[PDB]
């Protein structure tokens, strides 16, 4: 037998506004999400999700496999050695069933010095051709703006949640240099489902993807209306029920790493379930050079002896560690 997850559904609308007390209020429902099974839906968040869904699936419905090789990453595709991870990550039909395209910061362009400089984890997105996809790389790009946005703001939530003044992570979440990414996600309906394509949990549950920690600050993801995300507690795996009208947010390793694991990056899992869905994550990464000082809420002076940790190093090394540890997407 396996349990639901207590997600509970926060209005986040007051983070927008300029009423002290209402955001404190909000801080609270984050602090007390965070400190429990790690999740909630962020309802009242201004972004029509309706447009996302719509705008998502006729891109992956009509992108064709001459275009996906065009747009592959290196992983699929031996030319493009400067695709790490923006691009197109193909299915393999009989083999491996999720397929996805990722998006970084429209801001990186050629001008951009950290693209000059070649530093890891920069790149520049490509896209498809517009008059193949009319008005898709317009959709993509603001959306990355709508829900950096609404990332903004749930910020300033869990600073004030942790007892910090509210720019306490969102000064360091910037258009001009910020690292985060979005993931069009495509779990297809395959009939029949190959088992090449379905993994087994030690507890014996059919996954479509491994238990891991989320590689971001905060995690801010939309999925459409099937269930499948499952949360670790100590008392095994709990059902996280869908909700396609809000955002699931949690807080990514990066964050229980700076608050001494006071809020602990929860350790999700994805059920298998033969039913076409999205899944469309925004991972709210900082700047490549952006440093936290670590913290210990439980303390009363604060303290932690954790080292600061730069985003960059961060977000390079974890990228890295979760392909090999749950595979190439
Ligand atoms: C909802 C999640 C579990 C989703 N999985 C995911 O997005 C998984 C786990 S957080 N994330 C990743 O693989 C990291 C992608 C990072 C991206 N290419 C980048 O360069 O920034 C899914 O639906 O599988
Ligand atoms: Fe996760």
């Not at 290196?74 to 197109?88: F, M, P, S």
């Not at 530093?119 to 790389?137: A, C, I, R, S």
């Amino acid at each position: 037998s396996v349990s639901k997850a207590n997600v509970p559904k926060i209005d986040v609308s007051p983070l927008f506004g300029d009423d002290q007390a209402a955001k404190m209020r909000v801080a609270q429902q984050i602090d007390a999400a965070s400190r429990d099974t790690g999740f909630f839906y962020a309802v009242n968040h201004g972004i029509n999700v309706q447009r996302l869904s719509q705008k998502t699936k006729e891109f992956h419905m009509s992108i064709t496999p001459e275009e996906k090789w065009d747009l592959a990453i290196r992983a699929y595709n031996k030319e493009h050695q400067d695709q790490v991870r923006a691009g197109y990550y193909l299915s393999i039909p009989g083999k491996k069933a999720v397929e996805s395209f990722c998006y970084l910061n429209p801001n990186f362009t050629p001008d951009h010095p950290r693209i000059q400089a070649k530093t890891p984890t920069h790149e520049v997105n490509v896209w498809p051709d517009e008059t193949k996809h009319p008005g898709f790389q317009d959709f993509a790009e603001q959306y990355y703006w709508d829900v950096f946005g609404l990332s903004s703001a749930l910020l300033k939530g869990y600073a004030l949640a942790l007892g910090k003044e509210e720019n306490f992570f969102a000064r360091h979440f910037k258009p001009d240099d910020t690292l985060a990414s979005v993931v069009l996600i495509r779990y297809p309906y395959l009939d029949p489902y190959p088992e090449a394509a379905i993994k087994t949990a030690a507890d014996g549950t059919k996954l479509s993807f491994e238990w891991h920690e989320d590689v971001s600050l905060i995690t801010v993801l939309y999925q459409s209306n099937v269930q499948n995300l499952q949360v670790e507690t100590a008392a095994g795996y709990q059902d996280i029920e869908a909700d396609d009208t809000g955002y699931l947010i949690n807080c990514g390793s990066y964050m229980a790493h700076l608050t001494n694991n006071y809020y602990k990056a929860p350790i999700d899992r994805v059920k298998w379930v033969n039913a076409e869905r999205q899944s469309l994550p925004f991972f709210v990464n900082l700047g490549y050079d952006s440093v936290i000082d670590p913290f210990d809420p439980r303390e009363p002076n604060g303290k932690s002896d954790r080292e600061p940790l730069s985003y960059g190093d961060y977000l390079q090394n974890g990228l890295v560690s979760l392909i090999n540890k749950n595979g190439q997407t």
